[PDB]
Design an enzyme around this catalytic site. Structure first.
Site, PDB file in Angstrom:
ATOM      1  N   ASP A  35       0.788  -1.478   0.021  1.00 13.38           N
ATOM      2  CA  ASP A  35      -0.155   0.028  -0.239  1.00 13.38           C
ATOM      3  C   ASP A  35       1.116   1.460  -0.005  1.00 13.38           C
ATOM      4  O   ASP A  35       0.293   2.402   0.010  1.00 13.38           O
ATOM      5  CB  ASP A  35      -0.943   0.190   1.139  1.00 13.38           C
ATOM      6  N   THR A  36       1.923   0.994   0.610  1.00 11.45           N
ATOM      7  CA  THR A  36       2.696   2.164   0.697  1.00 11.45           C
ATOM      8  C   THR A  36       3.538   2.695  -0.326  1.00 11.45           C
ATOM      9  O   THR A  36       3.612   3.375  -1.594  1.00 11.45           O
ATOM     10  CB  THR A  36       3.949   2.287   2.088  1.00 11.45           C
ATOM     11  N   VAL A  79       0.455   5.678   0.087  1.00 15.52           N
ATOM     12  CA  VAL A  79      -0.383   5.953   1.093  1.00 15.52           C
ATOM     13  C   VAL A  79      -0.828   6.815   1.100  1.00 15.52           C
ATOM     14  O   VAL A  79      -1.816   7.973   1.308  1.00 15.52           O
ATOM     15  CB  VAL A  79      -0.222   5.523   2.696  1.00 15.52           C
ATOM     16  N   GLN A 131      -0.639  10.043  -0.749  1.00 16.49           N
ATOM     17  CA  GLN A 131      -1.331  10.485  -1.462  1.00 16.49           C
ATOM     18  C   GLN A 131      -2.444  10.363  -1.665  1.00 16.49           C
ATOM     19  O   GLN A 131      -3.620  11.853  -1.894  1.00 16.49           O
ATOM     20  CB  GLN A 131      -0.507  10.382  -3.301  1.00 16.49           C
ATOM     21  N   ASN A 143     -10.533  -1.091  -0.905  1.00 15.38           N
ATOM     22  CA  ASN A 143     -11.122  -1.206   0.086  1.00 15.38           C
ATOM     23  C   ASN A 143     -10.865  -1.040   1.358  1.00 15.38           C
ATOM     24  O   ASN A 143     -11.171  -0.462   2.890  1.00 15.38           O
ATOM     25  CB  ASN A 143     -11.823  -2.821   0.017  1.00 15.38           C
ATOM     26  N   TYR A 144      -9.527  -0.440   1.957  1.00 11.03           N
ATOM     27  CA  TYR A 144      -8.439  -0.037   2.952  1.00 11.03           C
ATOM     28  C   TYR A 144      -8.521   0.548   3.784  1.00 11.03           C
ATOM     29  O   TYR A 144      -8.759   2.160   2.983  1.00 11.03           O
ATOM     30  CB  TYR A 144      -7.592  -0.447   3.408  1.00 11.03           C
ATOM     31  N   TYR A 184      -6.753   3.649   6.872  1.00 10.73           N
ATOM     32  CA  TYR A 184      -6.092   2.780   7.653  1.00 10.73           C
ATOM     33  C   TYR A 184      -5.634   4.789   8.326  1.00 10.73           C
ATOM     34  O   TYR A 184      -5.419   5.513   7.318  1.00 10.73           O
ATOM     35  CB  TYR A 184      -4.254   2.722   7.218  1.00 10.73           C
TER      36      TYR A 184
HETATM   37 CL    CL Z   1      -8.927  -6.156   5.743  1.00  7.42          CL
END
Ligand code: CL
Ligand code: CL
Ligand code: CL
Ligand code: CL
Ligand code: CU
Ligand code: CU
Ligand code: NA
Ligand code: NA
Ligand code: NA
Ligand code: NA
Lengths: 620, 620
Positions: free
Chosen positions: B290-291, B296, B298, B373-374, B376
């Site tokens: 993800d990073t 992340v 942006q 979908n995530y 954080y």
């Molecule tokens: Cl998840």
């Protein structure tokens, strides 16, 4: 009218009368423990019978007694004379806290020791220390306390700053005999003071802290009814208090749609011990069952508003017995409040364009206690999403010694000449489980790594496995952080909409357990502590993992003995005993008063609900 | 005037001009990454030189470029054409999020697959999924994204509720070719909706939540100067923001008496990956950095007052580049505030009669981001007592699939026919340590159990041991919860009043690390994840444990390669890389939107101070 209500002063006075009239409470008698008994199982249709359990001490030297009485029927239900060499001695009395120092105050051995060190007896504090069970044959059957000394320079001096090493004494508090005085030699007594309220030490206090105001203009979201019954955000429980265990949670259940769904029948911290790892004979016998030997509940503090409990606070004031069966109130000994807990759920979706954020919160039930140098906060949390959590907060003053010239493998130096022996604080949470009712089982769940190969060609697959614990002889489990080991409590007879047994998952911190050699006295007396998880079959007389009389008890008693019954735990009324603790190598930062450290555990719903139980939470 | 200030819009526009003038920014060019470079070491006396680092994409099919420029001197410092088959592809562009679905929208294979399932193409969402590196030889050197489909029933439907299993497609986003379409067969598409804002699902929302007001009538205790420089309760730091890593902490130091004492030079989450453990060919290639792949920072959200950040909030609004080098503002992307944190220290002494209680508090620096979908939250905490803590909060919607008739060892059922493949979220915290300055070392500390015997007659002694890590080839450490393993960062040249090297102690949660088979592609591409702790010698070009170009990179790069240099780490400028993560077996409670779960780590002072650093805190 709830059978689970807190003891009333009135009830305590009745117990005293009953005992007094029964002849059991003469002038030499002392109440070392008094607690109300939980309603029994099989009373899904029974009438009020309040019973209390008493441990009576005799200061003249007669055998102590265990007595159960009914405060609704003013009857002695049972009264039994205890053999203390066999079943153990009674908990330490607060009135005995002053006794050791006084006995030694007139002993020539002690005085010789003090004079050699040039210490004025009137300035010498002597901790009233539980003695445990070692090699001293004359100690079996005697009520012994050991003494370690700390110089207090003036009425408000922190005596902890000034340990007297190389010296210990044992005393029989009954016969008032000093049995042994041991001087292994002189150590310099550390000189600096540890007076954390002296401007000389604190220095100029800070002016930089701006205030933080936390208020609830419409009151709190929880209701309290019948003294101690709590309803909050779907949760239902009763908040109890026992002088041994302290705050105890009863009948934890969750209101799901139109059902009241039970989760845990009873939650408590059933024992807590502090073993020391310094092999010096002056301290190697130290193991303080703060709960079992001293009784944490009797020493709960009155929590000061704005200082000890911030926000909209609702207090309970639990009533206890004194040594003479008089009722004493612990004004505001228990705080109950709700606090914000950050984000509960959040998603901004790249396709629906919906942005969604909900806040979390938790209900806290807490109390704080003092046992000598130690001060502990015990916190229970209920979260919106169904999570149940306990947290212990450890603070106070570190138990001190001299720091040895040449250093130590078992002691930390906090200040010049000042040492802090390594120890642990190990708790036992007793969880009388009731997942959708009493038909529960426990599975141990591990992560399962899979080898690259047929049916896992890319070597990315991983899985898990659950192992049902069926009998007590195989329900003694250890942690395995490396394989993400958890334990699931489920009801095999209650399934969720996907036809899966509803469950809750225990997540432990996986801290080290009892480090003592298995052959040690403490290993046998604190066997619960040598493993992370125990599951037992419920029974009326199995309350503490260390048995009912911890003080100077031989060992083997408690958990190790109950599991010998090897009872069916697969779909039955069961109890999980979770061991968790802090291994404390004291730092300079811990001195002269230590910042809070924490340990705990939590349980999260695992297929308990048919979906997230927090969709109905409104959007601020 | 601080070299550590946040990038200004003005600076971003200068970068664009510089590149544009240098010819590097034609109409086919795209900015996939833009970030300011930290000041270098050896500038204890240097002048302002702001440089930025750019990754430029070409949509026509030309080789991409890495370019460094000085925004103070308007010069291209370096410009290099990358070979992507060799060093990896550039991060995914937000503009490419729509591309996969569009390409497939006109492919006959795809349409055949959709028609067989009776799915209207206009209702079929296709996730833009990073492709990783597997067996597809034609993929080397091509910019590939893989596609998985989810039906959206109406503009505001949660498409996640409706996965299309048994089908996947790969696409070359450059040549705009659909390279492969794979149909392993049809699965029913789960039918229930997952619209967590539909009254039909939420049901009657709660009216039981009373408000909780948190206010600061005198303002906050922290000051902000020069945009991002924070001073709070002895702490000093600079709060940075990079589009890859997100919030980054600079120059963390503690004001002790009259010295400003450095602790950590730079703290960041340097990488985060989500490997899936479902051996289905439809998903077994899923591993989302993800990073590293998506960046992340942006996608940080604008945090809404009262909703996302409660209390007296101070916002920073970090400026980023768009794909065309225009500056865009993330309004209120970063929250900074202080919150109460319960009891700091407390003791009621049985001898002095002194009762003492002090409150704790923490400074929070946080931001929240969305990647598909995530969602954080990344939180950094500084506590009064010197503790430094990070906490990730994981929420959003679970990545979904079909649930197989007959069940699964690698997938959880959340709803009828609806599955959630097992995965992990594994973070890497990069900690450029500076304990009282740059001369640091790391020791691994374990608890040591001692056998009963000579010099430990009672078998109560326990100790510990520290092992200095001297060279990089032996600084790859794994957790050992069972032996209370921690890691101490110390300065061997700076001692406390007791003549002990000052240190800080890292306490990890000891969660499982990467579960993949070591022979897996992900094991090599995410090697950092296979061990809890790495220590490297500091260097200017070693920023991420996965190297600079994660997307479709071969493997081996990053940490495994740096430690090959086997450099001196014993009393040198060093960096600790800490791996920590969540192993996520999705539950019913996670559906249709998941409650926050958390993971993190913390560091506590270990002989850093000469005594508790919080004696000067006033008593409410
Ligand atoms: Cl998840
Ligand atoms: Cl509280
Ligand atoms: Cl302690
Ligand atoms: Cl926040
Ligand atoms: Cu301790
Ligand atoms: Cu997850
Ligand atoms: Na015995
Ligand atoms: Na039970
Ligand atoms: Na390569
Ligand atoms: Na460093």
């Amino acid at each position: 009218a709830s059978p689970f209500r807190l003891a009333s002063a009135g009830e305590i006075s009745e117990v005293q009368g009953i005992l007094r009239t029964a002849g059991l409470l003469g002038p030499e008698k002392r109440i070392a423990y008094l607690g109300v008994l939980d309603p029994a199982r099989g009373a899904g249709s029974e009438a009020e019978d309040r019973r209390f359990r008493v441990f009576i001490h005799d200061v003249s030297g007669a055998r102590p007694q265990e007595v159960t009485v009914s405060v609704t029927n003013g009857t002695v239900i049972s009264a039994v004379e205890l053999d203390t060499a066999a079943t153990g001695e009674l908990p330490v009395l607060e009135e005995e806290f002053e006794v050791v120092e006084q006995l030694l105050a007139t002993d020539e051995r002690w005085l010789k020791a003090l004079a050699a060190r040039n210490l004025d007896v009137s300035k010498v504090r002597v901790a009233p220390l539980s003695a445990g069970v070692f090699e001293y044959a004359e100690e079996r059957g005697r009520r012994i306390l050991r003494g370690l000394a700390f110089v207090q320079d003036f009425p408000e001096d922190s005596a902890w700053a000034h340990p007297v090493d190389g010296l210990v004494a044992y005393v029989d508090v009954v016969s008032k005999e000093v049995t042994r005085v041991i001087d292994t030699g002189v150590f310099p007594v550390p000189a600096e003071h540890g007076n954390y309220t002296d401007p000389e030490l604190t220095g100029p206090l800070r002016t930089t802290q701006k205030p933080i105001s936390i208020t609830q203009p419409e009151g709190p979201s929880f209701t309290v009814t019948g003294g101690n019954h709590i309803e909050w955000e779907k949760w239902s429980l009763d908040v109890g208090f026992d002088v041994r265990e302290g705050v105890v949670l009863h009948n934890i259940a969750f209101r799901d749609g139109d059902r009241l769904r039970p989760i845990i029948n009873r939650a408590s911290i059933a024992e807590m011990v502090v073993p020391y790892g310094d092999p010096s004979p002056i301290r190697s016998w130290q193991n303080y069952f703060d709960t079992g030997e001293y009784l944490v509940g009797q020493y709960a503090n009155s929590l000061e508003l704005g200082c000890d409990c911030l926000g909209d606070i609702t207090y309970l004031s639990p009533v206890i017995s004194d040594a003479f069966g008089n009722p004493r109130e612990i004004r505001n000994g228990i705080c109950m409040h709700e606090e914000d807990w950050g984000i509960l759920a959040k998603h901004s979706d790249l396709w629906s364009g919906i942005n969604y954020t909900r806040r979390n919160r938790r209900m806290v039930i807490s109390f704080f206690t003092t046992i000598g140098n130690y001060d502990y906060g015990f916190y229970w949390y209920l979260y919106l999403d169904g999570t149940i959590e306990f947290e212990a907060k450890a603070t106070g003053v570190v138990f001190t010694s001299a720091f040895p010239e040449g250093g130590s493998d078992n002691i930390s130096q906090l200040a010049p000449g000042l040492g802090a022996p390594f120890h642990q604080h190990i708790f036992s949470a007793r969880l009388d489980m009731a997942i959708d009712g009493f038909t529960n089982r426990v599975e141990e769940e591990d992560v399962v790594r899979q080898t690259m190969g047929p049916g896992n060609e890319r070597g990315n697959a991983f899985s898990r496995k659950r192992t049902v614990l069926t009998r007590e002889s195989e329900a003694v489990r250890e942690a395995d952080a490396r394989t993400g080991r958890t334990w699931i409590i489920s009801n095999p007879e209650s399934k969720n909409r996907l036809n899966e047994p509803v469950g809750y998952k225990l997540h432990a911190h996986n801290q080290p357990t009892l480090l003592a050699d298995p052959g040690s006295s403490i290993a046998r007396r604190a066997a619960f502590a040598t493993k992370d998880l125990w599951v037992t079959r419920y029974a009326d007389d199995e309350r503490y993992p260390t048995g009912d009389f911890v003080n100077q008890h031989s060992g083997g008693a408690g958990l190790p003995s109950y599991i010998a019954q090897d009872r069916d735990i697969d779909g039955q009324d069961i109890v999980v005993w979770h061991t968790f603790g802090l291994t404390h190598f004291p730092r300079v930062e811990d001195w002269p008063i230590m910042p809070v450290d924490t340990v705990g555990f939590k349980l999260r719903p695992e297929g308990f609900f048919d979906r997230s139980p927090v969709l109905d939470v409104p959007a601020n």
